[PDB]
From a paper:
By revealing the evolutionary history and loops appearance of [name] chitinase, we discover that one loop which is remote from the catalytic site, is necessary to acquire the new antifungal activity. We demonstrate that this remote loop directly accesses the fungal cell wall, and surprisingly, it needs to adopt a defined structure supported by long-range intramolecular interactions to perform its function.
To investigate the contribution to the antifungal activity of the 45 substitutions, we constructed mutants of [name] + Loop II with substitutions in proximity to loop II. We chose six substitutions within 4.0 Å from Loop II and introduced them accordingly to their proximity to each other’s. C The crystal structure of [name] + Loop II integrated with all six substitutions ([name], [name], [name], [name], [name], and [name]) revealed the interactions of these residues with loop II. Mutations A, B, and C increased antifungal activity 4.7, 1.2, and 5.4-fold, respectively. These substitutions increased antifungal activity while retaining the same degree of chitinase activity. MD simulations of these mutants revealed a gradual reduction of loop II flexibility directly related to the introduction of these six substitutions Furthermore, these substitutions decreased only the mobility of loop II not the one of a loop region between the ninth and tenth α-helices (positions 192–201).
Residue numbers in the entry: 0 to 231
Write the structure that this text describes.
Amino acid sequence: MVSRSMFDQLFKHRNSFYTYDAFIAAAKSFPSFGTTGDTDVRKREIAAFFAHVSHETTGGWPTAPDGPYAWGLVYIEEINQSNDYCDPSTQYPCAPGKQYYGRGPLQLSWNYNYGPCGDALGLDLLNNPDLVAQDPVIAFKTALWFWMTPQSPKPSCHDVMTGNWTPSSADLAAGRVPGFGVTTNIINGGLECGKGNPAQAENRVGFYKRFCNQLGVSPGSNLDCANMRPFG
């Protein structure tokens, strides 16, 4: 896994809601996370997951102590909470009086994600979405659920980083070569990769390179998703 002192180095300025013990408890729901492959592969997977988490929750500024990548895990809830984030569904019905705005380390959003995430975790997140912003174990589990779950045609980010996803010829033709860049593409490639404004993807890479440096691992190849088409 990762030790308490290293978690406290990566996340030196975090919101104290996000405890190390909560992260460790959540990771036990997905025992292959960070335990797959040799030491370099494990370190890159952990750095990659934390880079995305940090991008989505960062409270940094350019002159912040320890630099602009040292302020991950500051945010819990989406700040703009007026829309319900509800698309009508017979499988995952929007609960009366509830909203599905972003919550937790990967900003889980929409009834159509809270539904299946809760089903997989054995939790009624569809009818109690506020659980994600109440309980840091649940919060971390929702982020790991996303990271560990394939959604065809997309592989899991876990499988990409650990060598368990081999691209098809169409993937390769589209520039989807395994590495950090493909994880950005999976998470939000329609807006952030290809010809999207690359500011946000570049920020994710900045966090990733910082965390790789702190963990003592090379970031590897194929970091940039501007050279890459979103999955169909």
